[PDB]
């Protein structure tokens, strides 16, 4: 099956069923303990949602590919409130290359390692078979509002044998999601007087995608493998007003419909596989060169995010991201019937970002120890990794799996990952699984780096009205969950039934600091000699809720699915603020009809929960007016269907929101000078949309 306690797979069948727009963030967060949200409450960058996993934040959501990691949006700079300008690294693959998609959640996904404290995401994609095969797909949507951008994909895969120790593996994919338009939430938006008059808060941002990749895989003699593969992925956006805090300038109606940022990805990596008398070895190295060049922006209060028009153009953050890993597998038989798994792994992230570094000190006064002007661009960690799993079957059908992992981050240190995960087959039909594992979050090069500097005149600083800093440290303790999880799960004859309730307690979160830790000296007028904050580590803070699932074969050719994710509680416990905003439950179901052998109809609707946003502003004030605003409950419905024509080509067609249910983005959960409050309301919801694809494969 597709669900059990703490994992998710995601077929080709299911996303050719449930077709995604670009994003595969758009079927992967319909998996339990998965919804789509930012990063903290600040409602910044809403419209920028991705994968979150049992309330921990995208940030501790490891996206691999093939197993080879996606560091991505670490180019991106990492603001105040812990929202970068990113669209997430869930669009590099294209969706009808995918193979599979697995989820893996909570203590069963701690072993994975650094940023799998919420989970992790593996893009699996289509390989080489014995002969050769190929396909082409096209996918293209049409909303019924024309505000609404809309999306156009098609992609080709290809792959096959040379000799007979050569295979190979190509796709291309060339895909356009509109922009929406600039003022798509006009009339929506939340109050906007004196010097903010008019501005709106944007629509969702654009993208075009240009992805390349080919494969080679070598398989030198009958127990060794070795593959060689390289690929080249572009995003360029188009730009529909989104600022940090919904204010605008000049330079930003210059730029609607323009692009201003493109993501430029290249990765090579030189994988090899044995497998022999004694075991299984994997090992690979992959390198992964990210350039993010966007236009410049301020770095100073409401000038935070926001096109810089003193200093007009393009710059160019670099990411060199290497990540070399190896393990071998042991079948063991002794005293229980085990297996050991022992592996290593190493990685390095260079960061080059001339623009981040660049905040000056002639205002707040000169900060001892970080110069004022031409701060270094650079930032790096490493981390060097050795780990070891015991899968032991203590009885047929039960077992258990202890396992350490060690990291050594050549920054802030030694970290101990202990799991252990229990399944418990209590009966042929039921099983009971438990599992309990400290997961590992090393801060970010911009969380560390002391050269990083944020300022503002008081409205974004804890505790007063007057102007402040908010600076890296290079002291921070990683961040440390314990993610306890307990389910059980009823599986036989297609019937499929099962509840998991989660609790992950969350120890030392970094974000923005809350008490001053020293004083500057110098500046202008009523700003001069600002305080100094720095990224702390929040002692405590949890995360608790429910994942269900529920599949009925009402009869042969009918199916009824139902995933359910119920969010019990998200506390700052320092602050008692949320840590992020995710519906109260996100209940989706399908029904998958086999109409004929050459026909299937589907019916999906995903029920949203109430959504509550945060309790206090930067300041720490208890919020009011509308940004005590809440989303109601509210469903998405869609038919939809894959009409088989030959066993050479296929069609699917297709209606998303049925009822033309739709959000609009009011801004940013709190208010501020001139702009009010947004509360929940922060993204666009779309409106009813016609969709038809198409694939031909041999
Ligand atoms: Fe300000």
Redesign the pocket.
């Known amino acids: 099956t597709k669900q059990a306690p703490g994992v998710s797979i995601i077929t080709a069948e299911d996303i050719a069923k449930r077709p995604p727009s670009n994003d595969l963030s758009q079927i992967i967060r319909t998996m339990p303990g998965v919804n789509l949200t930012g990063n903290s409450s600040s409602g910044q960058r809403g419209n920028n949602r991705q994968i979150d996993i049992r309330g921990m934040g995208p940030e501790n959501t490891l996206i691999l590919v093939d197993g080879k990691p996606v560091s991505s949006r670490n180019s991106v700079r990492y603001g105040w409130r812990g929202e970068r300008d990113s669209r997430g690294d869930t669009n590099w693959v294209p969706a009808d290359q995918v193979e599979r998609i697995e989820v893996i959640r909570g203590p069963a996904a701690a072993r994975y390692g650094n940023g799998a404290a919420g989970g992790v995401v593996n893009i699996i994609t289509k390989q080489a078979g014995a002969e050769t095969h190929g396909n082409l797909s096209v996918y293209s949507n049409f909303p019924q509002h024309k505000a609404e951008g809309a999306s156009e994909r098609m992609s080709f895969g290809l792959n096959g044998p040379l000799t007979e120790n050569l295979s190979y593996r190509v796709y291309g994919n060339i895909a356009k999601t509109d922009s929406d338009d600039w003022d798509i939430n006009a009339g929506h938006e939340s109050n906007r007087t004196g010097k903010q008059a008019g501005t709106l808060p944007a629509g969702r941002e654009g993208v075009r995608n240009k992805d390349i990749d080919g494969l080679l895989s070598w398989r030198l003699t009958p127990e060794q493998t070795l593959e060689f593969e390289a690929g080249f992925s572009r995003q360029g956006n188009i730009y529909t007003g989104d600022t940090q805090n919904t204010n605008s300038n000049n330079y930003v109606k210059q730029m609607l419909g323009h692009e201003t940022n493109r993501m430029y990805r290249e990765t090579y990596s030189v994988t090899h596989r044995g497998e022999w008398d004694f075991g299984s070895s994997l090992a690979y190295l992959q390198y992964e060169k990210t350039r993010n060049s966007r236009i410049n922006e301020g770095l100073?209060?409401?000038?935070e995010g926001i096109f810089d028009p003193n200093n007009a153009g393009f710059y160019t953050a670099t990411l060199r991201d290497l990540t070399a890993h190896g393990e071998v597998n042991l079948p063991l038989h002794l005293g229980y019937e085990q297996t050991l798994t022992l592996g290593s792994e190493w990685t390095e992230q260079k960061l080059d970002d001339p623009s981040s570094n660049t905040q000056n000190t002639e205002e707040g006064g000169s900060i001892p120890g970080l110069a004022g002007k031409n701060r270094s661009s650079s930032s790096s960690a490493r981390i060097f990794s050795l780990f070891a799993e015991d899968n032991i079957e203590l009885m047929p059908g039960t077992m258990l799996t202890p396992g350490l992992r060690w990291d050594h981050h050549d920054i802030v240190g030694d970290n101990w990952s202990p799991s252990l995960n229990l399944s418990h087959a209590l009966t042929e039909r039921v099983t009971l699984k438990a599992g309990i594992a400290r997961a590992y979050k090393a801060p970010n090069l911009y969380q560390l780096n002391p050269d990083y500097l944020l300022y503002?005149?008081?409205?974004?600083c804890y505790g007063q009205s007057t102007s402040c800093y908010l600076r890296g440290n290079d002291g921070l303790k990683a961040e440390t969950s314990v993610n306890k999880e307990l389910g059980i799960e009823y599986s036989h004859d297609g019937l499929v039934a099962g509840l998991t309730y989660f609790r992950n307690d969350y120890k030392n979160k970094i974000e923005s600091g809350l008490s001053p830790v020293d004083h500057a000296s110098g500046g202008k007028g009523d700003y001069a000699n600002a305080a100094i904050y720095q990224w702390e580590n929040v002692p405590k803070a949890v995360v608790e809720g429910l994942e269900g699932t529920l599949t009925l074969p009402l009869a042969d050719g009918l199916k009824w699915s139902n995933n359910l994710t119920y969010m019990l509680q998200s506390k700052n416990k320092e602050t008692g603020d949320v840590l992020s905003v995710t519906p109260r439950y996100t209940l989706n179901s399908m029904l998958d009809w086999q109409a004929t052998d050459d026909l299937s109809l589907q019916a999906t609707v995903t029920w949203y929960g109430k959504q509550k946003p945060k309790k206090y502003d930067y300041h720490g004030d208890r919020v009011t007016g509308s940004a005590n605003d809440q989303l109601s409950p509210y469903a998405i419905a869609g038919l939809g269907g894959t009409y088989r024509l030959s066993k050479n080509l296929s069609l699917g067609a297709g209606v998303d929101n049925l009822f033309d249910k739709r959000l609009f983005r009011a801004g940013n959960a709190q208010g501020?000078?001139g702009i009010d409050g947004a509360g929940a309301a922060t993204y666009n919801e779309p409106g009813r949309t016609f969709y038809t694809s198409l694939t031909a494969s041999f």
Not at 300 to 303: K, R, S
Not at 456 to 460: A, L
Request: aromatic share 0%.
């Open positions: 100073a209060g409401g000038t503002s005149r008081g409205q974004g501020v000078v």
